[PDB]
Amino acid sequence: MAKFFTISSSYIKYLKDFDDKVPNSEDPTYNNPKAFIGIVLEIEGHKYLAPLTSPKAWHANVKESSPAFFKLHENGVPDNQLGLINLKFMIPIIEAEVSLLDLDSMPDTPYKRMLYKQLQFIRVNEDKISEKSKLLRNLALQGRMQGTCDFAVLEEKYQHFGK
Amino acid sequence: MAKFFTISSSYIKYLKDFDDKVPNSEDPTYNNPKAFIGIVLEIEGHKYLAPLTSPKAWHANVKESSPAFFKLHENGVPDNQLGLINLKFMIPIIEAEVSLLDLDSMPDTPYKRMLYKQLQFIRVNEDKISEKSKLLRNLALQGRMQGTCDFAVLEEKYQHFGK
Amino acid sequence: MAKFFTISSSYIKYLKDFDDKVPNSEDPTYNNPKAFIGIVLEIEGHKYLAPLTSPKAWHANVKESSPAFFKLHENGVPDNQLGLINLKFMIPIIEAEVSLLDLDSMPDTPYKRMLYKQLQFIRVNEDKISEKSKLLRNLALQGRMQGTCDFAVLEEKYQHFGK
RNA sequence: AUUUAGGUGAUUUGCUACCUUUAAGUGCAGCUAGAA
RNA sequence: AUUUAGGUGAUUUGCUACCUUUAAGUGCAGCUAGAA
RNA sequence: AUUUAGGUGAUUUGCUACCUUUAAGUGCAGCUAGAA
């Protein structure tokens, strides 16, 4: 619970073949790799990682009640917005295709300090994040969320990676 | 719980014959009929409605611990005092002799807006109001309350109205 | 629980024969006898009383997590420090050798006013004090606390007092 | 309309919390700055 | 009188919370304003 | 990257709380100062 991961580009491409909403893993504008938080949900043998995303203007219109997102901010400093967990684009993973961020070897950077500020807030809210993940998947499967990842198709296809 | 009612004048007079502390229900001074809130208590098959009453000076001396009263005020605006529920003068009712207020059809008036501000506070505290009503009846029957309605005689006599 | 006691000087000196850290009980400079609070711990048939002690400079360096002490202050007035319960020098007692303070009949003095402020703060924290007492004894017996009373020796020896 | 129930603190002014003789003194404020 | 137990955070300055080597990082403040 | 799920209030503007059609309206703010 509450660990940062990166995901192999080839696994991302494999999943993208079946669902184009799977998060982008390559972009020349990315300063660091796409970080995921996990494991946000473990259900029916599937382990899910959810992508982190930096602030965007439309994040202002996100209601806390939406399980598609978990808004992040510094513990006790709500004005210090730290992006959000984009649960609506979480994906099931093969453990061979994911790797923990090597925080204790990464050099001291503004990004690493932000990662730790995010981590404290996530750890304190782990149960809320898992509840939102479970609810979001459940509603999306029933067609009661719009434009999330295709959890049925991803759960049907992901284990055929490399096979 | 937390609904506004009016009570037939004949039922009120019937009960008043057995207990003169039964609330006055009609008066030319009334801008609106005497409103009751209910059902505040259901015990031994008897359903109780409690009268609302507008501010009086002596209400300032009412302590929260007294189950004879439930002071009302606007949610989050304690200085906007809205009278009280006079639990000590609650009465058991016959369903045929009471009527819901027709809120969804009543014309919009300042009185109706006040009713809604009262209703919100009552809804939020419905459990407390019910606890106070039960406690008040229990203490009054043991003779440990001051000048309440005579719940024993009222429960003995009320069902024989019209029979 | 949460009662003030004095302990007979002979019992104190008897225990001091086996453990020199047992609190000094009389000193010509003392305005009042050394007051104890109890019963803070009841374990394996032993009843424990803990000495109260007035402020010392080093009390500023005491951390709340230490079960060796329970700092006292006026309820809701943290700046009004009232010394501490020195649990690390608590002792098992023989009931015949302890006496309640005569709070009912003692004349009103500033010391008695302070005693009552201490009593309120202790009463509100009774469970916390008992937890600290049990933990401190447990850790001291394992050598995980420093310079407390010798609870093993005191519990072995206290009952042969007077025989 | 019907004009404040009694209690819970070795102590308790106001409000509050709590209890309903089948069971309960918490929190805030005020005052207090005592001594081991 | 007797003059600070050690820990719990992939990170943690103060205090607090939590745990008692079988375990456990909460909250406030401080600093931080990073980027997918 | 991927640009707000729908509901819960005899009433409900924003946010929040709550519920996941098996169920659910709390809190803050705004407005209101009504009368038995």
Numbering used by the authors:
A (entry chain E), B (entry chain A), C (entry chain C): 0 to 162
Q: Which passages does the manuscript contain on this structure?
A:
In type III TA systems, the toxin is an endoribonuclease (RNase) that cleaves cellular RNAs when free, whereas antitoxin is a noncoding RNA. The toxin also processes its precursor antitoxin RNA into smaller repeats and subsequently assembles with the individual repeats to form an inactive TA complex. The type III TA complexes are unique self-closing RNA–protein assembly, in which the toxin and antitoxin are arranged alternately in a 1:1 ratio.
Crystals were obtained in several conditions; however, crystals obtained under a specific condition in P1 211 space group diffracted to the highest resolution of 2.097 Å at a synchrotron X-ray source. The asymmetric unit contained two hexameric assemblies of TA complexes consisting of six ToxNEc and six ToxIEc repeats. However, the biological assembly comprises of one heterohexameric unit consisting of three ToxNEc and three ToxIEc repeats. The heterohexamer is a cyclic assembly of three proteins bound to three RNA arranged alternately in a head to tail manner. The endoribonuclease toxin ToxNEc is a well-structured protein consisting of five α-helices and seven β-strands. β-strands form the core of the protein that is supported by α-helices on the outside. The core of the antitoxin ToxIEc RNA repeat contains a pseudoknot, which is flanked by single-stranded regions on either side (5′ and 3′ single-stranded regions). ToxIEc forms an H-type pseudoknot consisting of two stems (S1 & S2) and two loops (L1 & L2). There are several base-specific interactions by ToxI at the active site of ToxN involving nucleotides G30, A31, A32, A-3 and U-2. The residues Lys33, Thr52, Ser53, and Lys55 are found at the catalytically active site of ToxN, and the residues Trp57, Phe88, Tyr110 and Gln117 hold the RNA in place for ToxN to cleave the precursor ToxI. The electron density at the active site suggested that the 3′ terminal phosphate of ToxI cyclizes with the 2′-OH of A32 to form a cyclic phosphate, which is an intermediate in RNA cleavage reactions and has also been observed in the previously solved structures of type III TA complexes.
